[PDB]
C-alpha cells in the first residue's frame, strides 16, 4: 500500500516495443463475410489476444494442461483475457515523426529548450529547400534553409563540413547532439565571476533549467517518436447492429490513414523516387500523426461525407464528453426510480410514500433471497414466476423487507445538501409519491407537475448514513446560517393565525375558565368564539431552580384559541409566548426557544402537533375569495369625470402650442398615478372594517372576512404591492430600453386591463424570465470552479500559544445589526484580555471560549470591539490550533480535528445566488458623532461642505449604530455640520443639480492667465445670459496643444501677486477643469465665496469580485507614500511622477484627468490613500498593504453586494475560500534559493526554520505573499490529476507529462479519479490510523 | 432509536463513528447470525445495532476485545 | 364536483377565470329552468314565451 | 372540455399547492374518462431456415 | 415510469439514461461535490468505480451483498487507464501504478 512518490521520464521506443505485443503492419480489420480478425492488421488476435480462454484456434491446447504452450498448428498461445484490455501492438515508421504537444503547445518544451524560433524550423520542415541539418561549420547554421542554387555555394565552399538537407532527422540529431551539463557548470563558473544583470538572470534561467533536466533525469531524445504503440482492439471497438449495419470509433480511420501512408512511403523509398513526393508523403504522415494527436486545431477540420468533423482521443478526456465531467465524476445508477410527486398531509416526519410496484422492482433480490429462505420459491425460476404472478406473500414480505429499510429521495437541481435526504418508506398503492409538506422548501418543490427521483442504500454503511446523516431528523439547520428549515409552508400558519385571534364582535365576552378543557368543550360544543379574549386560568411552570421545574397557576384574560392551544406547550415556558396572535416570526422563535432550553424531542412532537392542529382547524376555519373581496368603490364615476376634465385641459394646452409634450406628458402620468392611488385608498377603505356589526349596542365595526388581508398578514401569499396591483395602479412600466414609460397602468385586474398595458407587462415578464433561465450556468461555473480548488485543513496543536489575530466588529451598516458581535464572538477564543466600557475590567486571561454567557455578558456591556487569535493568526506550521477556529457548530463546542469543509461554502453561497440577481450629510437620531478622515470646509454660507471625496454620510442613532448610510458629492452644499444633532426627516442639503460651484473665498482681481484660446480651452460665450471668460472644455474636446497643461484663471491683487488662501502661505487660483466657465471678463475682481467658474452638469460584479480581475477605468489610491507629482502630459491620459521619501520615484500611471484627482501636483499622499474618485486593484492592497487589510477589503465589498440582496452567509466561508486563492511566495532576497521563486510559503517557513536558525544567522532569503486568482491555483497545484480533469485538459496534460509528473494521490480529486479513499469522511478512521502509525514508527 | 440518531452519538460522539460502529456491529448479525443483546422487538438489525450501541454495550474497543480473545482461543485450540 | 385552492389567484392574477365562473353559474341557472320545463312538459305557448 | 361545479377552498392539505380535489361522481359519468388508441405491429420477414 | 439498469455504450461502455430504456440519471459535478461536502467517501468511491466505469468493484460488491457482508473493494476506473493509453498514443510515457 504505502507510498511516497515515484519518477517519470519520456517514452522510450524500447518501452513501446516492450509494452507492445507485435507490430501492426496493415490497416485491414476483418473479412467481408467471415467477420473475423486479420493477421497483422489493427485487430491482430495473434498479438492482442484471442476471444476465448486457454485455447488455440484449432483448440488443441487447453485449460492449463498446456499453460505456456503455443499451438504450433496455428501458432497461438494458450493465455488469458483481461490482458486484452492491456495488450497493445506497436508500429515502426519509415521516418521519424514528432509529438505535437511538445511542439504546438505554449512554451514549446522543445523550442524553448533550443530557444531557436519556430517558423525557421517550419520552413526547414516544409522544406523551402535544402536546409542545414547540421551547420558543421558554424559558419553555416543549423535550421538554415539553403536553396538549390545557394546550397551549391555551401557545397563547393565546404562540401564536407555542413549537412544541409531535409527532414525531421535534423531536429532528432539536434536534440541528440546538444549537451546540457557543461553549459550549466560554465554559466555557473562565470556567474560567480560577475553575476550580471538580465544577461545573468537568463544565464541562470538556463543553468537551473539545464540542471533540472540533469538531476530530474530526462531524455529529450524521446521528445521524438520512432515507435508508435497500437491501442488494443476493445479500446476502439467495431461492432454490428441488428440490421447488419456496423459501428465504430473514429480512431480506426486515422490508424488506417497512418499505416497506409507509411506503407506507401516504404514503397517510395524502395524506388528512390523523386524525393518531392517523399516530402509530400512526409508532410502527409506527420499530418495524419498530428490529427491522431490533434485534428481540429491545425487548419480546416477533417470531416466525413457528413461534413461533421470526427472526435479525437483528446476529447475523450476533455471538457464534457471526456471521462471526467460526464461519466467518471457523475454516473448512471443501478436500482433507482423517479416519478411525479404529491402531498402527504398525514405523514410523520420520517415517512415517505412508496408505490409498492417500484418497492418490489428495486427490492427483488431481498424478496427472492427471502422466498428461498422460506423455500416457497425453491428456485429462482420459481421465485421469478411466483413474483410475476404476485403472490399474497410477496406483499407481506415486501413490507417485511421494507420495514426499517431507508431509501433516498432526489429532485433536480441538487443545489445544496438538503435537496437529497433519506426517509422511512410508507408503502402505498397510490401512484404519486407523498411528501411531508415541510420539506417542500429544502427541495424548493411545489406540486405543479414535478417528479422526484429515488435511490437505494444497499450496503450497511450506506443504510446507516442514510439513517444517521442524510436523515430527515439529523438535519434541522442550514450550515450557511443557523436558521431553522421547518418553516410553516403557507397553511398551518394561516390556521394558527386564525385561531389565537382576538376579535370583539362574535360573542362570549368575559366569562371565566378554569382552563382550556372547557375551552375545548365550549368551542367543540359550539358556544364560545375561538377568537374572544375571555378570562381563564393557567398553570404554567418554570425551571428557575437548577433544572428544577417550578409550578404555579394564575388567570389570564386570553383568547379561547391561545387557551386551547396552550396545553400543547411542554410545561417549561411562560404564557407570554402564546399571548400574541402568532406571527410566523414567533413560530421560528417558538421552535428555536423550544430546541434551545429543552433539547429537542419536545420541539419535535410539539411541531408535529402544531402542524396537525393548524391543518385540522384551518380546514375547519374556512378560507376562500370572492369578487367583492376586491372592490367596486363608490367614487368610480367621479374620479373618471375628474380625470376627464384634467385630460381635456391637457388637450387644450397641447392645442395652444405651449406645454408641448414632455411637461404635459409627465404631468399626465403623475395625475393618473395620484388619481388611482386615491382609488386604491377608496377601495381598501371600502373593505377592511366596513362590516359594522352591532353587538349589545348601537354599532361597531370590525375586521371583515375578506381573507386577502389575512393571507397577506401571516406570510403565506401576497403583500401590499400584490394587493395594490389588484387594487391600485401597477406602478410605472419600463419598456425593454430600461427607460420608464410616462403614461401608466391606470386600471387593475378587477376593473379591467388595456391591451397595451398587458403587452407592456409581457416585455418585463420575458426579460426577467430570460434572466431566470440563463443564470443557473453562472452559479454553475462559479460554484464548480471554486469546488475544484477544494482542499482541507487539519489541526495539530491544542493551542499554538500564539498571540492575537483578527478583530471582531459587527456588520450593521446601511441598516441595523446584521451579525451581533455577540454572535461573532461566539465560540471563538479571545486574542487577549478584554475589558468593559467600565474599563480595566478584564474578563478573559488572554484566551477563553466565549460562549453566550460571555457574549451575553458582553452584550450587556456596550463593549464594541474585541480581538481573536485567528486561524490565520494561528502560527502553528502546516496547520492551525483549535482555539483559533473556536467552536464546532454541530458539536456546539470547541472543534475536534479532521472534519473540514468548503463545498459547504459553495452550496451556501451559490444556492441563494440563483434568484437573488432578480450633496447631503444627515444624522437621524440622537447621540455622539464620530466622522473623521475628511477634508471639508465651512463654505461661504457657513455650513459644512466636503472637499475630500472620501466621506459617506451615516445616520447614527443615540446608542451609536448606523441607521442609514448614503454617499455625498464632493464640494456639495450642506445645511448641517457634522457633530450637530438634528431631527430626522430633513433635507440636510438643498443642492443645485447642475452647478458644482467654484467659490473663491478670496477677494482679488481676476485676469486671464495660464489659459489661451484653443490650447487649454476654448473661449466660448455663455450665450443665454451674455458675458463670459476663458471657457474650459472637457478632456477630449480641446486640442492637444494645451491639453498637456492645466488651465487656471488666476486671482491677483493690484500688484499681480498670488492672493494666498486666507490663513496660510498657499497661493489661491483654480486649475479650472471642464465646464468651469467663468462668466465675467479679464481684469474683473472676485469676492469671498465667489464663483469664478460655474460648472453645469449585479451578479456580473459577483463574477468580478470572485475571479480577481483588475478594476477597470478610473484612477486609484496612492500606490506609494512620499511626495507625488505629475508626469507625461496627456497622450490621452496624463501620468503621475511619484517621488517616494526614500523609495523609488519612476512609477507613473496613466490617469483620466477627465476624472478629477485629489492629490495636487506637489501635494503629498500617504500610500493607500485615494488619488481620485474611483476604486483600486486589490492586488495593489496585497502588494502594498498586508494580508488582513486586503482580505478585509474583499470580504467587505462582496458581502455588501450580497447583503444588498437580502442575503446571509456565515462569512467564515468567504475567508476560507480566499485562503484557497493562492499561496505563492515570491522570495524577496536570495542566497538559499532563487531570488523571487514561487515556493510553498510552507517550505519557506521550513527553510527559515532551518537556515536562519543557528545554522546561519541568515544565508537565505525572505519572502512575500501573492494572489492572481483561484483558477490558476487550481492549475497551480502539486497534483496534475485534479488539474488535468477540467477544461483545457490538453495544455494541462502537456505541461504535466513534460515534467514526467507522478502525483502522490492525496488530494480529493486525485484519489477520487482512481477510486481510492482520501483523508476524511468514511476514510477518516483509516487515514488517522495511518497518522498514528506514522507517529508510531 | 428508530426515528433519530442522536443519543447513540451522545454516547460515542460522531455520526461517522456511530454509523461505522452500527455497521460493524450488524455485520456480526446479518451473516454471523448470533444473538443480539437488546431485545428484538421486530426490527431489522439497524435498530438493534443502534440500541446495542445506545445502552453502552457496543463500541469498537469492545468488538476488538471480543474478536481478539476469541481468535487467540482459536489459535490455542488449533495447537 | 371539485374543490380548488384559491391560494394563488392574487399571485396568479387570472381574474378572467373568476368571471368565467360567474357567467357559467348563471348559465346553469337557465339550463335548470329548461330542465324543469321539460320534466313538467310545458305547453307550446310557455316554451315559446320563456 | 366539460362544464361542472367548482368551489374554492383549502381542504386538509389536498389542495395544498396547485393540486385539485374532486368528487367521485364525475367518473361514474366517465365524462373526463377517455381513450388512447395505441399501436402494435409484426414484421414477418425472410429467414434463412 | 421507474426502472433499473439498462444498456451500455460501445466506445466508453457506460450505462444508460432515459427511463423507457431503463435509465439511470446523469449527474453534474455539483452532485458529487455535495457528497464531498457531506463526507460519504465510501459512497463517493461507489459512485466513481462500480456503477459506471469499474467492474471488479461492482461485481465484488454484488457477490458480497448476497453474501450478507456489504464490503468495499476499490480498484481503478477504466477511465483512468484509458486516459493513459490516450496520452500514450501521443508518445509520452504514461503508465499504471497497478497495485
Ligand atoms: Mg414546481
Ligand atoms: Zn489451435
Ligand atoms: Zn492559533
PDB file of N, CA, C and O in Angstrom, chain A residues 1307-1335:
ATOM      1  N   UNK A1307      -4.743  14.622  -2.469  1.00  0.00           N
ATOM      2  CA  UNK A1307      -5.877  15.489  -2.650  1.00  0.00           C
ATOM      3  C   UNK A1307      -7.141  14.733  -2.997  1.00  0.00           C
ATOM      4  O   UNK A1307      -7.175  13.515  -3.180  1.00  0.00           O
ATOM      5  N   UNK A1308      -8.218  15.507  -3.090  1.00  0.00           N
ATOM      6  CA  UNK A1308      -9.546  14.928  -3.217  1.00  0.00           C
ATOM      7  C   UNK A1308      -9.689  14.243  -4.561  1.00  0.00           C
ATOM      8  O   UNK A1308      -9.681  13.010  -4.658  1.00  0.00           O
ATOM      9  N   UNK A1309      -9.677  15.045  -5.617  1.00  0.00           N
ATOM     10  CA  UNK A1309      -9.909  14.570  -6.965  1.00  0.00           C
ATOM     11  C   UNK A1309      -8.835  13.569  -7.398  1.00  0.00           C
ATOM     12  O   UNK A1309      -9.095  12.725  -8.265  1.00  0.00           O
ATOM     13  N   UNK A1310      -7.683  13.579  -6.720  1.00  0.00           N
ATOM     14  CA  UNK A1310      -6.560  12.712  -7.055  1.00  0.00           C
ATOM     15  C   UNK A1310      -6.902  11.261  -6.759  1.00  0.00           C
ATOM     16  O   UNK A1310      -6.910  10.407  -7.651  1.00  0.00           O
ATOM     17  N   UNK A1311      -7.191  10.966  -5.497  1.00  0.00           N
ATOM     18  CA  UNK A1311      -7.585   9.617  -5.135  1.00  0.00           C
ATOM     19  C   UNK A1311      -8.955   9.273  -5.687  1.00  0.00           C
ATOM     20  O   UNK A1311      -9.254   8.096  -5.921  1.00  0.00           O
ATOM     21  N   UNK A1312      -9.802  10.289  -5.851  1.00  0.00           N
ATOM     22  CA  UNK A1312     -11.106  10.112  -6.486  1.00  0.00           C
ATOM     23  C   UNK A1312     -10.956   9.415  -7.836  1.00  0.00           C
ATOM     24  O   UNK A1312     -11.502   8.327  -8.053  1.00  0.00           O
ATOM     25  N   UNK A1313     -10.160   9.995  -8.739  1.00  0.00           N
ATOM     26  CA  UNK A1313     -10.168   9.549 -10.134  1.00  0.00           C
ATOM     27  C   UNK A1313      -9.710   8.097 -10.289  1.00  0.00           C
ATOM     28  O   UNK A1313     -10.082   7.441 -11.271  1.00  0.00           O
ATOM     29  N   UNK A1314      -8.974   7.554  -9.315  1.00  0.00           N
ATOM     30  CA  UNK A1314      -8.650   6.128  -9.279  1.00  0.00           C
ATOM     31  C   UNK A1314      -9.555   5.368  -8.318  1.00  0.00           C
ATOM     32  O   UNK A1314      -9.421   4.148  -8.180  1.00  0.00           O
ATOM     33  N   UNK A1315     -10.486   6.056  -7.669  1.00  0.00           N
ATOM     34  CA  UNK A1315     -11.420   5.421  -6.776  1.00  0.00           C
ATOM     35  C   UNK A1315     -10.753   4.753  -5.598  1.00  0.00           C
ATOM     36  O   UNK A1315     -10.940   3.554  -5.385  1.00  0.00           O
ATOM     37  N   UNK A1316      -9.958   5.505  -4.840  1.00  0.00           N
ATOM     38  CA  UNK A1316      -9.450   5.027  -3.564  1.00  0.00           C
ATOM     39  C   UNK A1316      -9.646   6.123  -2.523  1.00  0.00           C
ATOM     40  O   UNK A1316      -9.922   7.279  -2.854  1.00  0.00           O
ATOM     41  N   UNK A1317      -9.576   5.738  -1.256  1.00  0.00           N
ATOM     42  CA  UNK A1317     -10.032   6.620  -0.194  1.00  0.00           C
ATOM     43  C   UNK A1317      -9.085   7.805  -0.001  1.00  0.00           C
ATOM     44  O   UNK A1317      -7.920   7.782  -0.412  1.00  0.00           O
ATOM     45  N   UNK A1318      -9.624   8.861   0.612  1.00  0.00           N
ATOM     46  CA  UNK A1318      -8.970  10.164   0.734  1.00  0.00           C
ATOM     47  C   UNK A1318      -9.211  10.490   2.215  1.00  0.00           C
ATOM     48  O   UNK A1318      -9.904   9.706   2.882  1.00  0.00           O
ATOM     49  N   UNK A1319      -8.730  11.613   2.781  1.00  0.00           N
ATOM     50  CA  UNK A1319      -8.322  11.597   4.203  1.00  0.00           C
ATOM     51  C   UNK A1319      -9.434  11.482   5.230  1.00  0.00           C
ATOM     52  O   UNK A1319      -9.132  11.133   6.376  1.00  0.00           O
ATOM     53  N   UNK A1320     -10.663  11.876   4.912  1.00  0.00           N
ATOM     54  CA  UNK A1320     -11.689  12.107   5.928  1.00  0.00           C
ATOM     55  C   UNK A1320     -13.001  11.459   5.476  1.00  0.00           C
ATOM     56  O   UNK A1320     -13.025  10.653   4.541  1.00  0.00           O
ATOM     57  N   UNK A1321     -14.094  11.804   6.156  1.00  0.00           N
ATOM     58  CA  UNK A1321     -15.373  11.168   5.885  1.00  0.00           C
ATOM     59  C   UNK A1321     -15.350   9.708   6.282  1.00  0.00           C
ATOM     60  O   UNK A1321     -15.036   9.357   7.424  1.00  0.00           O
ATOM     61  N   UNK A1322     -15.709   8.838   5.335  1.00  0.00           N
ATOM     62  CA  UNK A1322     -15.657   7.404   5.597  1.00  0.00           C
ATOM     63  C   UNK A1322     -14.217   6.943   5.813  1.00  0.00           C
ATOM     64  O   UNK A1322     -13.945   6.130   6.705  1.00  0.00           O
ATOM     65  N   UNK A1323     -13.278   7.463   5.018  1.00  0.00           N
ATOM     66  CA  UNK A1323     -11.865   7.155   5.149  1.00  0.00           C
ATOM     67  C   UNK A1323     -11.156   7.824   6.298  1.00  0.00           C
ATOM     68  O   UNK A1323      -9.930   7.700   6.412  1.00  0.00           O
ATOM     69  N   UNK A1324     -11.883   8.558   7.142  1.00  0.00           N
ATOM     70  CA  UNK A1324     -11.233   9.322   8.194  1.00  0.00           C
ATOM     71  C   UNK A1324     -10.530   8.415   9.182  1.00  0.00           C
ATOM     72  O   UNK A1324      -9.387   8.678   9.584  1.00  0.00           O
ATOM     73  N   UNK A1325     -11.217   7.361   9.616  1.00  0.00           N
ATOM     74  CA  UNK A1325     -10.627   6.454  10.584  1.00  0.00           C
ATOM     75  C   UNK A1325      -9.352   5.823  10.040  1.00  0.00           C
ATOM     76  O   UNK A1325      -8.345   5.764  10.744  1.00  0.00           O
ATOM     77  N   UNK A1326      -9.345   5.422   8.767  1.00  0.00           N
ATOM     78  CA  UNK A1326      -8.167   4.758   8.210  1.00  0.00           C
ATOM     79  C   UNK A1326      -7.029   5.743   8.009  1.00  0.00           C
ATOM     80  O   UNK A1326      -5.854   5.412   8.225  1.00  0.00           O
ATOM     81  N   UNK A1327      -7.358   6.962   7.585  1.00  0.00           N
ATOM     82  CA  UNK A1327      -6.327   7.971   7.419  1.00  0.00           C
ATOM     83  C   UNK A1327      -5.655   8.294   8.745  1.00  0.00           C
ATOM     84  O   UNK A1327      -4.424   8.343   8.830  1.00  0.00           O
ATOM     85  N   UNK A1328      -6.443   8.505   9.799  1.00  0.00           N
ATOM     86  CA  UNK A1328      -5.826   8.779  11.091  1.00  0.00           C
ATOM     87  C   UNK A1328      -5.187   7.528  11.697  1.00  0.00           C
ATOM     88  O   UNK A1328      -4.287   7.648  12.531  1.00  0.00           O
ATOM     89  N   UNK A1329      -5.635   6.328  11.305  1.00  0.00           N
ATOM     90  CA  UNK A1329      -4.892   5.121  11.658  1.00  0.00           C
ATOM     91  C   UNK A1329      -3.491   5.204  11.089  1.00  0.00           C
ATOM     92  O   UNK A1329      -2.500   4.934  11.778  1.00  0.00           O
ATOM     93  N   UNK A1330      -3.400   5.596   9.818  1.00  0.00           N
ATOM     94  CA  UNK A1330      -2.107   5.813   9.182  1.00  0.00           C
ATOM     95  C   UNK A1330      -1.342   6.943   9.857  1.00  0.00           C
ATOM     96  O   UNK A1330      -0.114   6.899   9.925  1.00  0.00           O
ATOM     97  N   UNK A1331      -2.044   7.953  10.372  1.00  0.00           N
ATOM     98  CA  UNK A1331      -1.364   9.051  11.057  1.00  0.00           C
ATOM     99  C   UNK A1331      -0.738   8.582  12.357  1.00  0.00           C
ATOM    100  O   UNK A1331       0.422   8.898  12.640  1.00  0.00           O
ATOM    101  N   UNK A1332      -1.492   7.841  13.168  1.00  0.00           N
ATOM    102  CA  UNK A1332      -0.909   7.340  14.402  1.00  0.00           C
ATOM    103  C   UNK A1332       0.211   6.364  14.104  1.00  0.00           C
ATOM    104  O   UNK A1332       1.199   6.303  14.843  1.00  0.00           O
ATOM    105  N   UNK A1333       0.067   5.597  13.028  1.00  0.00           N
ATOM    106  CA  UNK A1333       1.142   4.716  12.606  1.00  0.00           C
ATOM    107  C   UNK A1333       2.393   5.513  12.251  1.00  0.00           C
ATOM    108  O   UNK A1333       3.506   5.136  12.634  1.00  0.00           O
ATOM    109  N   UNK A1334       2.228   6.616  11.515  1.00  0.00           N
ATOM    110  CA  UNK A1334       3.360   7.478  11.185  1.00  0.00           C
ATOM    111  C   UNK A1334       3.978   8.073  12.440  1.00  0.00           C
ATOM    112  O   UNK A1334       5.194   8.283  12.501  1.00  0.00           O
ATOM    113  N   UNK A1335       3.151   8.356  13.446  1.00  0.00           N
ATOM    114  CA  UNK A1335       3.680   8.738  14.748  1.00  0.00           C
ATOM    115  C   UNK A1335       4.306   7.544  15.461  1.00  0.00           C
ATOM    116  O   UNK A1335       5.356   7.676  16.101  1.00  0.00           O
TER     117      UNK A1335
END
